[PDB]
Amino acid sequence: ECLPGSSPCTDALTCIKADLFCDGEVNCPDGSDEDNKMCATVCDGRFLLTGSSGSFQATHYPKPSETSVVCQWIIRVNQGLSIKLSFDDFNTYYTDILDIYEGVGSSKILRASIWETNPGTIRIFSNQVTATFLIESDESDYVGFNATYTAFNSSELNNYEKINCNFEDGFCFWVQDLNDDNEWERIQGSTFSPFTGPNFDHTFGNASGFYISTPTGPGGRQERVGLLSLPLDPTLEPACLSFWYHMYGENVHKLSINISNDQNMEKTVFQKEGNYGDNWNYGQVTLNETVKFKVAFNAFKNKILSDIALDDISLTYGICNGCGGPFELWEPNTTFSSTNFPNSYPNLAFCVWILNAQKGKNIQLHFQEFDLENINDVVEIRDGEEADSLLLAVYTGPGPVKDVFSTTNRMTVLLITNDVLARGGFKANFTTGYHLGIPEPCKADHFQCKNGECVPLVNLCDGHLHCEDGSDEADCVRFFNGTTNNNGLVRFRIQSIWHTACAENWTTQISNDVCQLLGLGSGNSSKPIFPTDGGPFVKLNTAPDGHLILTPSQQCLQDSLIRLQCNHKSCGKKLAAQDITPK
Amino acid sequence: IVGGSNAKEGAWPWVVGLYYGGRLLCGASLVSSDWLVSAAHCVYGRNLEPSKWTAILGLHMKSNLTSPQTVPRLIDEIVINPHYNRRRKDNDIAMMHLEFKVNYTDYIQPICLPEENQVFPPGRNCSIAGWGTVVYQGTTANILQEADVPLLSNERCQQQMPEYNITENMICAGYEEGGIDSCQGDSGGPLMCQENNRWFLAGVTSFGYKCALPNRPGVYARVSRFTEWIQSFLH
C-alpha cells in the first residue's frame, strides 16, 4: 500500500504521485502510467493521438450533457511541425473552461481559456499539446464541442502570413503574452460596459464580425494586456505596419507598440494617448530593422470605461505613404442638345428643360459646348421647385462657363433668343448626386465659412481675414432685447456661446469701436442699467496696438450692463454747397 | 427726367454713373465703401465680365471726366437678386462690387438705407436724379437732371397699370397727368425721399409703360423689402 494520495503502477513496485498520471511523462518503469485504457476518457474514448490528423468530442456530443467527466487529450506530432486546432462548434457553460497546455508533464504552459465563445482556429507552435476539458455545470441546454487537429510546418511562414490577420477566425499566429496582467478576449459584436469601445466590426461593417479587445471585466487596478508576434525575417527594404485601432473611453491612458529583438531591447515606435472618438482610426508606422524583431501591441488599461480594441493588422513593404422644344427629362437623358444643335440654332427659339430628380438630390449641370450670341441671347438657369422661380447663373457668349450646382430637385432653364444674328448654340449634360458642389464640412469643431475652407478658432471674430468671403468675421456680436433698430445690449460670442459683456473699464473709445464692429456709426452714448445675463460675460479691454483684448473671465462684483446706443452712419446728408430754390 | 431742370454740381453725390465700355446705361447708388445699388434689368446678361462696367464716382457732367473730383473705379462682381425674374420684372435690384476703396469727400458720400417696416405715406414728395432723357424719342442729357414725383398707393398703381403685375415689392411714383416722370435710359436711378433731413433710398427706377405720357407713373423697386439682402453684402 502506497502513501495516501499516491497510486501504484501495474507491477505494484513503485509509488508515484496521483497528479503524475496521464500528464505526458512516463513515470512507471513499465510504462503503465501512459496506458490508453487507464487514461481512457468517457468523452471520445481516446487519450493519446499520434496521427497527423483526427478529431475529438466531449461526452455525448449529439446529445445534452448529464454527467461531469474529466477528459484530457495529448497529441504528439513529428518534430519541427506545429499543431493546428480547428473548432467547428463550441457552445458550453462558462464553468466548463477548456484549458490548452503547451507541452507535456508538469512543465506544460497554459495559453488560453475558452468559455461561451467560439475560439475559431488556435495554432500552437509546439509538437506536443495537452488539452484538458473540465465539466462543472449540469445544464442540459448545451450541445458540446467538436474540434479537429491538423499538422503544418511553421518554418515556411512568411512575414505577411505572420502579421496580416483580420481577426475574423480566431488568432492566425499571434501568441498572447504570459508576463502581462490579462489576456485578450475574443468577443463578437457589442461587448460589456456599454458607451465604451466599438459597437461593430470594422472589416464587415456590422456586428457579425470578430475582433479582439481588452477584457471588459470590472478591473479595480491597472492591467497591462500585450500580444506577441512571431519573429520576422530581416528584409532589405523597409515595411509599413498598417492597423486599425479604436481608442474610445473615459480612462484611456496610453496605447503603445514595442519592438522586441533577440537582445531584449524594446523600442517604442508608436504611441497614442487620450480619447480619439468612437470611430476606427487609421494608424501606420514604418518598420525598419536589420535583424529579427517582434511586434507587440501592449495596451495599458485603467479601471472601468477604458476599453481598447484592435482589428485589421497587416504589414506591407515600403515606406508609409502620406417654341416646340423638349420638356422634362430624367436620368437616362443626360446628354441632350437644345433643339437644333448640330449646327447654328434658329432665331425666335424659346425652349425649357425642367430637370427632374429624386427628393433630396441636387443637379450638377456640366456644359460640354457653349457658344452663344452677345448680351441679347443668354441662358437663365433657375432653381424654382415651385411657382416662385429663383436664379442661379446667367451664362452667354462663347466661353468655358463654370459648373452649376442646384439646391432642390428641380432646375428650369430658359433659352432667350433674338430674331437676328443666329449663333452656334450650347450643349450640356447633367449628373445627379448628393450634396454636389458644396464641400463636406470638416467635423471636430471645425467652423466652415462660405468659401469652403476650415477655420475652427483662428478667425472666429478675432481680427483676421482668412476666409475670402468674409464669413470668418460673421455675426458674433449683436443687439439683445433692443427697443429700436440701433439699440440693444452688447452680447458677444467667443466661439459658440452668445453672452453679454462686463463694464469694468468701459469708455467711449471702446464704445464707438464696438459700434463700428456692429456695423453702425459711432457711439452716441452708453448708460449702464443693471445686470441680468448669467452667461460668461467678457471684460472688454483695449490696447494701444489697435485691437480690443476680450478676456472671458467669469469673475466680477457689482457688474453693470452697458445699454449701447450708436448713432447712424454717413446717411444721405448733403455736405456740398447747395441751396434751396423752389424750381 | 423729362420735365426737370439742371441740378447743382454736388447736390447728389450718391449718384454713380455706370458706363459699359464707355457708355452710360443705368444709374447706381453707392452704399458701402465698395458696394453699389442698381436695377437688375440693365445688368442682365453682363455678370460674366464685371470688368466691362466702369464706376464713375462723383460725376456731374458726362463730358468733364477730367474733373479733380472724379474718382475712377471698376466693377469686379455683379450679384443679381436671387428672386429676380426679367419676364415679370420682379425683384429688380442688384449690387455691384467696386475694385478699390474710395475716400469720402464733399462730392462722394454714401446714400442712406431704408429700415424695415418704414411706413411711406402716399403723395410724399421724393427727389430723383440721373442723366436720363428729356423726351421719349430723343437723346440723353449731358447735364445731371433732377425731378420730383409723388408716391402712389399700391392699389391705385395696380388700377392705373392693368397690363403689369405690381407685387408687394414695387412702390410706384409719378404725376397723375404725366409730364414729369422717368424715361428711357434712366431706368435704374435712385428714388430719394426726404425724412428728418435724410435722403433714403425708397426705390430704384425699374420700368414703365411709356415716357412723358399722362396717367403713366413710374415703377420703383421697393428697396425696403431687400434690406437684409443688401446688409448681408455690405460687410
Residue numbers in the entry:
A (entry chain A): 183 to 504, 524 to 784
B (entry chain B): 785 to 1019
Which lines from the publication concern this structure?
Human enteropeptidase (hEP), also known as enterokinase, is an essential enzyme in food digestion and is localized at the brush border of the duodenal and jejunal mucosa. Activated hEP can stimulate the conversion of trypsinogen to trypsin via cleavage of a specific trypsinogen activation peptide, namely Asp-Asp-Asp-Asp-Lys (DDDDK), which is highly conserved in vertebrates. However, the mechanism of hEP activation remains to be established. hEP contains a multi-domain heavy chain and a catalytic light chain, linked by a disulfide bond. The functions of these domains and motifs may be involved in protein anchoring, macromolecular substrate recognition and inhibitor specificity. The light chain is homologous to trypsin-like serine proteinases with a typical Asp-His-Ser (D-H-S) catalytic triad responsible for peptidase activity.
And active hEP incubated with nafamostat was subjected to cryo-EM structure determination. Cryo-EM reconstruction of another ~29% of the particles of the active hEP-nafamostat complex showed an intact hEP with the LCM domain rotated ~120 degrees from the position of the inactive hEP LCM around the loop between MAM and CUB2 domains, with this inhibited hEP LCM in close proximity to the LDLR2 domain. This considerable flexibility was thought to likely facilitate substrate recruitment and expose the catalytic site for subsequent cleavage. The light chain was observed to remain firmly clamped by the CUB2, LDLR2, and SRCR domains of the heavy chain within the core region, allowing for the intimate interaction between the heavy and light chains after the hEP-activating cleavage. The binding of nafamostat or other covalent inhibitors to the catalytic site apparently results in a change of the conformation of the hEP core region. The complex marked by the dashed line displays one of the active states stabilized by the inhibitor.
